Amino acid sequence: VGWGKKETQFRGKGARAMEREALASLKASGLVGNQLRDPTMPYMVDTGDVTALDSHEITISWRGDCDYFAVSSVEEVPDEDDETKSIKRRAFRVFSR
Amino acid sequence: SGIAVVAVMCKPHRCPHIAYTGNICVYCPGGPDSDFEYSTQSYTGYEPTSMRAIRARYDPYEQARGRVEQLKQLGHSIDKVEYVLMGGTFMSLPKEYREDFIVKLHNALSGFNGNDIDEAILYSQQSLTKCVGITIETRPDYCTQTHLDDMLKYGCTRLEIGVQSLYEDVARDTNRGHTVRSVCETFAVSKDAGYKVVSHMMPDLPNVGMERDIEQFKEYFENPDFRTDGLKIYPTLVIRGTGLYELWKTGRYKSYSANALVDLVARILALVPPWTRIYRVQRDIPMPLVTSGVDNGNLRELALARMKDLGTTCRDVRTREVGIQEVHHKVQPDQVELIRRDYYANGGWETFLSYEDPKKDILIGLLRLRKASKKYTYRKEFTSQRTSIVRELHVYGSVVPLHSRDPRKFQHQGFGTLLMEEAERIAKEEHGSEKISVISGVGVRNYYGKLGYELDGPYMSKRI
Amino acid sequence: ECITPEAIFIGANKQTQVSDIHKVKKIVAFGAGKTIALWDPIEPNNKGVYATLKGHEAEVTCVRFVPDSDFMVSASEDHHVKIWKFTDYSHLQCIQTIQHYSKTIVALSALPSLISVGCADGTISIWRQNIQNDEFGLAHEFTIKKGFFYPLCLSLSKVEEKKYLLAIGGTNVNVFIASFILSDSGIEKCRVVAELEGHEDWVKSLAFRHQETPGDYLLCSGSQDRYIRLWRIRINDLIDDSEEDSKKLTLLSNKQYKFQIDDELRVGINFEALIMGHDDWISSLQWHESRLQLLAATADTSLMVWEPDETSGIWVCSLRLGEMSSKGASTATGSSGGFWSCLWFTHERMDFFLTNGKTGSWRMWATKDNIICDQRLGISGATKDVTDIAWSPSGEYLLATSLDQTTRLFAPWIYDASGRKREIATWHEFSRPQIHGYDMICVETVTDTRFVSGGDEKILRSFDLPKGVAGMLQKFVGIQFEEKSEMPDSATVPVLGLSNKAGEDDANEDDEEEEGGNKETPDITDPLSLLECPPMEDQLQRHLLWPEVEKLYGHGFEITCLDISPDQKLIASACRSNNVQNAVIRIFSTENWLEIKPALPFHSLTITRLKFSKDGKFLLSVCRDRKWALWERNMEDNTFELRFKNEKPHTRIIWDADWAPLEFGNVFVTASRDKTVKVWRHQKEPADDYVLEASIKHTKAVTAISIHDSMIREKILISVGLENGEIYLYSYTLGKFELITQLNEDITPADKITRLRWSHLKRNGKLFLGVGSSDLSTRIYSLAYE
Numbered sequence A: 001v002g003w004g005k006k007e008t009q010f011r012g013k014g015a016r017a018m019e020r021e022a023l024a025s026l027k028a029s030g031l032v033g034n035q036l037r038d039p040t041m042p043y044m045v046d047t048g049d050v051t052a053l054d055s056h057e058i059t060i061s062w063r064g065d066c067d068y069f070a071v072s073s074v075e076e077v078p079d080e081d082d083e084t085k086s087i088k089r090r091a092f093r094v095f096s097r
Numbered sequence B: 001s002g003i004a005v006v007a008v009m010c011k012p013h014r015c016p017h018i019a020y021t022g023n024i025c026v027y028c029p030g031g032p033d034s035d036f037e038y039s040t041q042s043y044t045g046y047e048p049t050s051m052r053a054i055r056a057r058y059d060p061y062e063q064a065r066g067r068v069e070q071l072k073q074l075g076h077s078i079d080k081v082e083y084v085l086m087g088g089t090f091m092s093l094p095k096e097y098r099e100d101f102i103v104k105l106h107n108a109l110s111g112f113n114g115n116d117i118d119e120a121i122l123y124s125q126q127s128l129t130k131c132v133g134i135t136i137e138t139r140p141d142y143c144t145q146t147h148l149d150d151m152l153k154y155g156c157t158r159l160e161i162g163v164q165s166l167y168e169d170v171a172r173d174t175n176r177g178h179t180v181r182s183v184c185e186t187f188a189v190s191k192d193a194g195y196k197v198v199s200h201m202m203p204d205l206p207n208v209g210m211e212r213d214i215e216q217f218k219e220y221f222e223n224p225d226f227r228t229d230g231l232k233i234y235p236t237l238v239i240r241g242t243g244l245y246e247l248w249k250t251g252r253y254k255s256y257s258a259n260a261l262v263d264l265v266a267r268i269l270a271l272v273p274p275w276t277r278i279y280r281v282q283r284d285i286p287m288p289l290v291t292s293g294v295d296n297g298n299l300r301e302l303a304l305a306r307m308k309d310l311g312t313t314c315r316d317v318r319t320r321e322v323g324i325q326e327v328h329h330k331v332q333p334d335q336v337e338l339i340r341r342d343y344y345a346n347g348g349w350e351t352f353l354s355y356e357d358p359k360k361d362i363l364i365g366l367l368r369l370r371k372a373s374k375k376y377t378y379r380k381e382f383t384s385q386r387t388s389i390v391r392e393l394h395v396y397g398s399v400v401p402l403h404s405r406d407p408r409k410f411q412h413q414g415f416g417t418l419l420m421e422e423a424e425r426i427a428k429e430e431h432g433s434e435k436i437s438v439i440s441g442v443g444v445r446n447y448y449g450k451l452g453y454e455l456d457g458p459y460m461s462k463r464i
Numbered sequence C: 001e002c003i004t005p006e007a008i009f010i011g012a013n014k015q016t017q018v019s020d021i022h023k024v025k026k027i028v029a030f031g032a033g034k035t036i037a038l039w040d041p042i043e044p045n046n047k048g049v050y051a052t053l054k055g056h057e058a059e060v061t062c063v064r065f066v067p068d069s070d071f072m073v074s075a076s077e078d079h080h081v082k083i084w085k086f087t088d089y090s091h092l093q094c095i096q097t098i099q100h101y102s103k104t105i106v107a108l109s110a111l112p113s114l115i116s117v118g119c120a121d122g123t124i125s126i127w128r129q130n131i132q133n134d135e136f137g138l139a140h141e142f143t144i145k146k147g148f149f150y151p152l153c154l155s156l157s158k159v160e161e162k163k164y165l166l167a168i169g170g171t172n173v174n175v176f177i178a179s180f181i182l183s184d185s186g187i188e189k190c191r192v193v194a195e196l197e198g199h200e201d202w203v204k205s206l207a208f209r210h211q212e213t214p215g216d217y218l219l220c221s222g223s224q225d226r227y228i229r230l231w232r233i234r235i236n237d238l239i240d241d242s243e244e245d246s247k248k249l250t251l252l253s254n255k256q257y258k259f260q261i262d263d264e265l266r267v268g269i270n271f272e273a274l275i276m277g278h279d280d281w282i283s284s285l286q287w288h289e290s291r292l293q294l295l296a297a298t299a300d301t302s303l304m305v306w307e308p309d310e311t312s313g314i315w316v317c318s319l320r321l322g323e324m325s326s327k328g329a330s331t332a333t334g335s336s337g338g339f340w341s342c343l344w345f346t347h348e349r350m351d352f353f354l355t356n357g358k359t360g361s362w363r364m365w366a367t368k369d370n371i372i373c374d375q376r377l378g379i380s381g382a383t384k385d386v387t388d389i390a391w392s393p394s395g396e397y398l399l400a401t402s403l404d405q406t407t408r409l410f411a412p413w414i415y416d417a418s419g420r421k422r423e424i425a426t427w428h429e430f431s432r433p434q435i436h437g438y439d440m441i442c443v444e445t446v447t448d449t450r451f452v453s454g455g456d457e458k459i460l461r462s463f464d465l466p467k468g469v470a471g472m473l474q475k476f477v478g479i480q481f482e483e484k485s486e487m488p489d490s491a492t493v494p495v496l497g498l499s500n501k502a503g504e505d506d507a508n509e510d511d512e513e514e515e516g517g518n519k520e521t522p523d524i525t526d527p528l529s530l531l532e533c534p535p536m537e538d539q540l541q542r543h544l545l546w547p548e549v550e551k552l553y554g555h556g557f558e559i560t561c562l563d564i565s566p567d568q569k570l571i572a573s574a575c576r577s578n579n580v581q582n583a584v585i586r587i588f589s590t591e592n593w594l595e596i597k598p599a600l601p602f603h604s605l606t607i608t609r610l611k612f613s614k615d616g617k618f619l620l621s622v623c624r625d626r627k628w629a630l631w632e633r634n635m636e637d638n639t640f641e642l643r644f645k646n647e648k649p650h651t652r653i654i655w656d657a658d659w660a661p662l663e664f665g666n667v668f669v670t671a672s673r674d675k676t677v678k679v680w681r682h683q684k685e686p687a688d689d690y691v692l693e694a695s696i697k698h699t700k701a702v703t704a705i706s707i708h709d710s711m712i713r714e715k716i717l718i719s720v721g722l723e724n725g726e727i728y729l730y731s732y733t734l735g736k737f738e739l740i741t742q743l744n745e746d747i748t749p750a751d752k753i754t755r756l757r758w759s760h761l762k763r764n765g766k767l768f769l770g771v772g773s774s775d776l777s778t779r780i781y782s783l784a785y786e
């Protein structure tokens, strides 16, 4: 989805900042005062570790017109962040006729 | 009569939300970086207004004067004109440019030749060829309180802040720099100031199905946050120069057929609440440069045939308007009644009053009233006690003929007074307010100064 | 030791009360920028503007000479009014200020010992001076109607020794007329006494003609409704009667306004005639002296002269001037711009009609007794800030751009159409190079007839020269241009100009024609009708453009600064920023117009000055972060490398730096907002680098510097300018600051100086200096240093 390149100049995201340079004789700086920008998440997404009181059964659900359905379970994700940490995460998937 | 719309253009620039996403939003065509490069964004430069702007090298004075004189010479005489601005994000530009622009746009009609915008607007109040407001286009990131004060000083009356979707992946995948939820607080702060707010929508977008398109509109009209006073629907058309054509080139994009789109429009028009004005389902497009989509010149001309085959025809303002004088007075109307609706929208209670025929559902005049809340008001006028605001007065009831014994030679010249006193009644009794205010363009600051309203700041107010 | 101001360039405003004349002397004094410029048309020499009276702070609106007296009053946007008195035969000086009127002033008119001021607060003030003290005392300050009235124009008339009237118009449809009588210092019995009917829009022009036959005269009025009407006024014993006590049919519109002013004077006013037939709003109405004629100017630039009709009784326009079709700078259809002022006067019998243009260009017509007319030489100048200067390589015609996208091309007039030298040469604008939408910040000249420019777009452009201009210059400025025949034919008039034309699509529609002045270099004029003066204002806007040659990209923002190599082969350029990666320099070769791969990353802020050394070996780089560098070039591939650097030269930002000739051994000088001028000298005994010699400081920030081309008597020249507008001239040798002079405050551009440039082609035993400031001014000085 990314596209941030302009020829004859240095662009593309990761480090590039501005397109609206302006000056002031007293060393102005900052576009501050504009909250909630960049709908990309501020940091890597949260995990889904289960709480203690939860049970561990298998649930199956249908839809109104009965064409698709969903089933839930608990996966053991490997968590590449640490090659010794693996997380038990509650998640569901969708299947068809 | 003589309502006039004179569009103007601003100098080319770049909206800064590109800075933290890299490029323009995908569907935006043209722009300074594109091959045209002498044109503001979202306009290819091939429109007649673009031609008239280029030959003037993007100057407001010449564009306004030339368009006004051309319209006057064609055969219509003008005494009521509303300006509309276009292109990019006008508010991004530096301080002095906007001030000079506004002063020139007012001195073009006033005939004044001064500076110090306060004096310019003061002279424009007492001028012929009255101005009935301005329409400024701006983005959520630039609607902070300082900018709102600037717009209130300038003389603007209604904004148009696009959202284009309510899902959250679309905002990041279309390279538009704002989360969806912030637009709600933008609406909340804007409405309490008396600014009529209109939005945009585009039915088909990448990674969006017909279903999601249906219930996004349903949630927009049902949820007490997305209730606004207008709408514009832009069917997605693929121009070669856009970032949308690259997706089709790489095969990462496909469009709807004709049947699917006409069915979608038919369903959508059968849900509009009766206080929102559907502006243009049949919008204006650069025709030959589109590569994907369908014809859009007569979408509603077939959607109407669809509702006649399914029932529950449209109920918007536009289809039910009768106009100022003799638009559909070829037949004598029927029973005239007063209809009053109340709704909760953006942390406040609002009232819509109208004079309508209930047997055939036509519209003659309408009024909007808002009870100011306590968690959004910041103006020193509205932070001293309870108050209510008349966001819009609209009187097509200047009609000479009517049903149920119209005034003989008085011909509904006191018709608006009925609605004004009706509003004051519930302001004194139900709201329990201690001050009532009305917002209007500077040119019409006298049609309200006769009923007793007195001037404070940019507002026309009177106590109780 | 002295100087001589060679030229003064400025443009008029777009107001209506700006122009003013002094009939006994005919000195056109008009406001411009924040000052008041003076000019005189009646002279065998067409010099132009010679002095700009200063003192104001904001833009001037209303200027009025007191009729046949020794004073002059001005009003500015600074909410102030200033008095001026003749201190010389052709020079004035401020004598008094007015400290009332928190709001600005819109209307102004004056007669001896009276001042009328219309304050946009909504009030009208009348002042009368003292018998022996020139301080104009206050007599009255009243209001026509608070809350709903704002004045636009005022006028005055003297009924008798101590009795006067006053007319008021503005945001209404009626003309108000009040009266008052004199006293010791004040005025008593002053109130509105008549409200004349008439127009359906705002009053815009008033005019009281003198009293030929005592007590009866005429008033004219024009309004935004495009109609002009008249009103006759009579004193007692001549007032029209039979209105009272006589069986006559009184019409609705023929009402007579009678008023008993005092115990012995009653005045009757009636309506006379309706004059129409115009295309836009009236802007200026002016009377005459020997005729019942008026001059009418519209917003369509059209000029009309209205005269009485002895046959039909209803006045018919006599002469119609301005049939040329022109709207703005770019003309498509119709005309626009209008005329925002006017003056009308005859010297012996040549009538003269002068009006302000749409781009600060005066247009003046002389005429032979109402029959035939001819346009004479006018004035032109900049309407916004003047940023960048650039001389010709040979020491000739200079290019001075501005913020109002009006590139300039001035030139001296040395061939005076008699085949000989003009006894006193005068400077004029001879060509308008380029016009476009952007602002055209930077411009540089590479060869005799080529230049490279850049505005606020991210591209640079290089232009060409047409043919007609070459011959016109070699006729008037005269100096020989060798091998000019190689250039191909070009055009004159584009419908819309991004640049002129250099192709076969069009041609030149003017024939080779030596209309006059054929006694110097005959048949040099490339196809054109040879004038007797520099090109006309009608010609400047659409004929003298230079076609473009090449476009070149490379930057990521708008262009900031560029410089040309001494070999005329390489060029360097850079744009402004505050990031590290957008503060670099890019270079191009003139023979191919292409980018060279390597970059030059050293700075983190905006590049301020770009300057190659005296020889094509070193490049200087200066910025705002107080860091400067010198880069070395390899003659083989023209690439560069960083050699010398320094990081703590000053504390405040650096503005400008200039080089030194090859004779003295590669010295340079830096000037910084620390008000500091430091001189950097070279030394290599204990370390190969550049060392510091000395420095000086002033009381205000320095802005730009320039050093003369060569050395005079084992010493060189130096010029330094401030943001206050002053100019200092210096003589300097190694370690010795030999101050020459501080230039007069009576001649300086009042606003911040931007660029000072020393010329090289000395002639008449003197050199030339070009000054460009943000005071809407561009000036030329001469140095006959001994």
Ligand code: SF4
Binding pocket: B015, B023, B024, B025, B028, B041, B042, B087, B088, B089
């Ligand atoms: S915000 Fe508006 S101007 Fe900017 S890229 Fe999107 S559509 Fe174009």
